[PDB]
Amino acid sequence: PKHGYRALLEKVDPNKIYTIDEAAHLVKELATAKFDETVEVHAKLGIDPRRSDQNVRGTVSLPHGLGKQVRVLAIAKGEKIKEAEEAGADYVGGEEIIQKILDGWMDFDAVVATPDVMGAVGSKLGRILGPRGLLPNPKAGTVGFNIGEIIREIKAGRIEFRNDKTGAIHAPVGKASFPPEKLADNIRAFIRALEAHKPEGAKGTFLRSVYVTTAMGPSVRINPHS
């Protein structure tokens, strides 16, 4: 999105490749104090993305911040509301829940949704969920009609990852509110999950470039082997 970020650019050296521990400490500085933000890791992979035998897809069981503890909100419609309840979502609502969130409620820690409510969710809650990194989307796997499976996967402590057509890949690894050592552990966990999924026959360096970022702030380049 358009960057106002500027008053935060001077804190990040764009030419430095930070260690994972330095980056975890930096991310904490920074982040706005006004709302929590999801921290993601983005990597460009040493794969030929036009080859179906070099796809990178799987899950990462983050050592911190997930499991039953995460309070998941599922927004759905009709039968899928029951499906979300039956899957154990902590909170469930139809489009009417949008009014509760607009009024100020955010007891939830994650948001998943069916595609049929996304027009309303984006329309009304885009500026609330977006900056917080809580806006569900199909590419991340947080929007789907298989709402029950999506909920059970998060509750089981797993985050999905899949490379895109450009050979890039990204996944959330925590929040800016996390203690830096926990954020570092989570960052390494995602890197290890990627490495474990390195396809047979991949050419050259696998993790070509890797960054830690948030939906609003600037990206921090990191050494994935640190």
Side-chain angles (χ1 to χ4, degrees):
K2 184 182 65 179
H3 306 292
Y5 183 92
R6 282 284 297 176
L8 188 64
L9 286 176
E10 286 178 340
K11 296 177 177 179
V12 184
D13 180 345
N15 289 300
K16 179 174 174 175
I17 295 181
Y18 290 80
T19 65
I20 286 168
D21 287 275
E22 291 170 335
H25 288 86
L26 188 58
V27 170
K28 300 290 296 174
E29 301 191 43
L30 307 186
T32 176
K34 299 182 177 178
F35 52 80
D36 209 352
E37 293 177 78
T38 299
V39 173
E40 294 223 19
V41 169
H42 290 251
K44 287 186 180 185
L45 308 177
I47 67 182
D48 171 352
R50 291 186 294 177
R51 293 179 62 149
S52 290
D53 56 349
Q54 295 192 357
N55 291 358
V56 166
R57 183 173 184 176
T59 59
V60 51
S61 293
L62 297 173
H64 314 285
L66 291 182
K68 293 181 179 179
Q69 65 178 322
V70 172
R71 290 186 180 176
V72 174
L73 169 58
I75 310 181
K77 193 171 296 183
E79 304 289 11
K80 293 290 177 171
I81 285 169
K82 308 305 291 182
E83 179 172 313
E85 294 171 355
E86 301 165 350
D90 302 72
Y91 304 107
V92 181
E95 294 182 16
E96 178 56 23
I97 208 169
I98 291 171
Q99 300 308 317
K100 185 175 184 63
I101 295 170
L102 287 171
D103 192 61
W105 176 76
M106 302 211 320
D107 286 348
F108 53 88
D109 305 307
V111 187
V112 300
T114 51
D116 51 8
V117 300
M118 289 300 303
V121 170
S123 169
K124 301 297 294 181
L125 300 177
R127 286 67 53 202
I128 292 166
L129 301 179
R132 288 168 173 84
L134 294 173
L135 184 61
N137 71 75
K139 293 185 181 182
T142 47
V143 170
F145 282 113
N146 54 323
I147 204 59
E149 292 180 347
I150 291 175
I151 292 158
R152 288 186 180 84
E153 186 178 44
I154 299 171
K155 290 289 183 180
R158 290 185 172 197
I159 296 300
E160 302 189 4
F161 55 80
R162 174 177 174 173
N163 71 279
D164 65 26
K165 57 180 171 184
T166 77
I169 196 164
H170 69 96
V173 297
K175 302 287 188 183
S177 62
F178 280 28
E181 301 300 350
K182 290 187 179 187
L183 191 66
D185 287 338
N186 279 3
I187 289 165
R188 293 198 185 84
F190 176 55
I191 288 166
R192 292 295 294 278
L194 291 178
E195 288 283 351
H197 284 84
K198 177 186 304 182
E200 298 179 3
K203 169 185 175 181
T205 304
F206 180 60
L207 301 179
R208 297 295 174 98
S209 59
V210 184
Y211 302 80
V212 171
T213 188
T214 59
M216 303 305 294
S219 298
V220 178
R221 187 165 173 190
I222 55 164
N223 173 357
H225 297 293
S226 61

